[PDB]
Amino acid sequence: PTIAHGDGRRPSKQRTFIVVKNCHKHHISTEMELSMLDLEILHSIPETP
Amino acid sequence: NRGLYNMVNEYSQRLGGHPATSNTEVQFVVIAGTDVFLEQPCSFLQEAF
């Protein structure tokens, strides 16, 4: 908005602002390790106790 | 030289004789008092601190 004034000052007309905001992307990673002997015996049915 | 009440009135009513500008690199004289919001108490008493 504006104000009316009594001086002869140059008058600011109607004004308006346009602003833009954008996104940012973030990434997360981690690494875990497992042995093959461990993964292999998940596949085979166990014979003895 | 006018009355004490004329001095009191002129103090706040009519802007002083050629005060400096603000928000400039150096001090130029004021010709157009758009937003001149100043008062000066040494003009009344003619003394410098």
Q: Which residue of chain B comes nearest to A5, CA vs CA? A: B34
* Rg of chain A, C-alpha, whole Å: 36
User: Resolution of the experimental model in angstroms, please?
Assistant: 5.5
User: Looking at the complex, does the CB of residue B24 fall below 8 Å from at least one CB of chain A?
Assistant: no
* Residues in a beta bridge with B29: B20
Q: Compute the C-alpha angle B49/B32/B7, nearest 5°.
A: 45
Q: How many CB pairs under 8 A join A and B?
A: 3
Distance CA B45, CA B49 (A): 11
Distance CA B31, CA B17 (A): 10
User: Looking at the complex, does the CB of residue A7 fall below 8 Å from at least one CB of chain B?
Assistant: yes
Q: Give the Cβ contact number of residue B10 at 10 Å.
A: 14
DSSP A7: S
